[PDB]
Ligand binder design. Structure first.
Ligand SMILES: C[C@@H](N1CN([C@H]2c3ccccc3CSc3ccccc32)n2ccc(=O)c(O)c2C1=O)C(F)(F)F
Ligand SMILES: [Mn+2]
Ligand SMILES: [Mn+2]
Length: 179
């Protein structure tokens, strides 16, 4: 029973905790043991939800936070309706305005390294990549940041709050030295 586990449950919203718990277990990871991965999936989920709330009403389809089968179901429906190519790997969102899938990244390292890896692994150049860091840097494909500055700023504020809350509990060092 780790301190990090109790912190995650009081730091994040209960719907977000439960969706992340079900994601871990679906893919074989235990949240009471892999507690840094527990904190990271919650964080990534919250960012995805904040992001999809950043535009107008019907702008984004949310692919993250579903079980494997339904996420791929919604992707197939988006593809066979948009004409957009079917990604090799599950993205997080679909942008009905710009007509493209989005992969959202949250990293504790310099955003450049993490984008390279997601780019290299993405294979599908099709998919737009948006990286956020816990220090306030962001980095997006073709310098196109999709949302306007204020919706991106609130995401960065929340990321820095999570980092401070961890740091006040001595969990940040273990969290950063674990990515
Ligand atoms: C399962 C889906 N994953 C994998 N993996 C994911 C995950 C989920 C459950 C168990 C292990 C892991 C690897 S660790 C991690 C850490 C933070 C946030 C998400 C995650 N991702 C890492 C970064 C992302 O940006 C992202 O979108 C995912 C993601 O969506 C997939 F694409 F493979 F179908
Ligand atoms: Mn995802
Ligand atoms: Mn992602």
């Amino acid at each position: 029973g780790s301190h990090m586990e109790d912190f995650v449950r009081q730091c994040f919203n209960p719907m977000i905790v439960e969706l992340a718990e079900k994601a871990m277990k679906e893919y074989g990871e235990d949240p009471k043991i892999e507690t840094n991965k527990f904190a990271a999936t919650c964080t990534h989920l919250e960012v995805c939800f904040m992001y999809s709330d950043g535009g107008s009403k019907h702008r984004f389809e949310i692919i993250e936070g579903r079980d494997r089968i339904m996420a791929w179901t919604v992707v197939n429906s988006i593809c066979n309706t948009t004409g957009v190519e079917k990604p090799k790997f599950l993205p997080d969102l679909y942008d009905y305005k710009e007509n493209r899938f989005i992969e959202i990244g949250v990293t504790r390292r310099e955003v450049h390294i993490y984008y390279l890896e997601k780019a290299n692994k993405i294979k599908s150049e099709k998919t737009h990549i948006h990286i956020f860091s816990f220090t306030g840097e962001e980095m997006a494909t073709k310098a196109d940041y999709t949302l306007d500055e204020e919706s991106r700023a609130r995401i960065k504020t929340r990321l820095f709050t999570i980092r401070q809350e961890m740091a006040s509990r001595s969990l940040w060092d273990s969290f950063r030295q674990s990515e």
